[PDB]
């Protein structure tokens with residue numbers, strides 16, 4: 001009950017974490033693409 | 042006992058989120074820099 005409220009907050013944090021892990025990986029892929037353009041030029 | 046467990050885990054997840062938000066924002070700031078560099082040379 002307070003245990004359910006906390007289990008739920010925890011689920012939401014773990015979901016945010018999954019989300020942030022993709023978003024940080026994509027940013028990393030874009031940086032490598034922008035650096036590749038810079039290096040080529 | 043289990044509520045903290047959950048409390049403990051909630052601290053750990055919030056800590057991982059803070060780290061990922063910083064890594065993301067570092068990369069975003071780097072993307073802005075590469076874009077400015079590229080568009081300006």
Ligand SMILES: [Cl-]
Nearest residue numbers: 031032035036
């Ligand atoms: Cl790179």
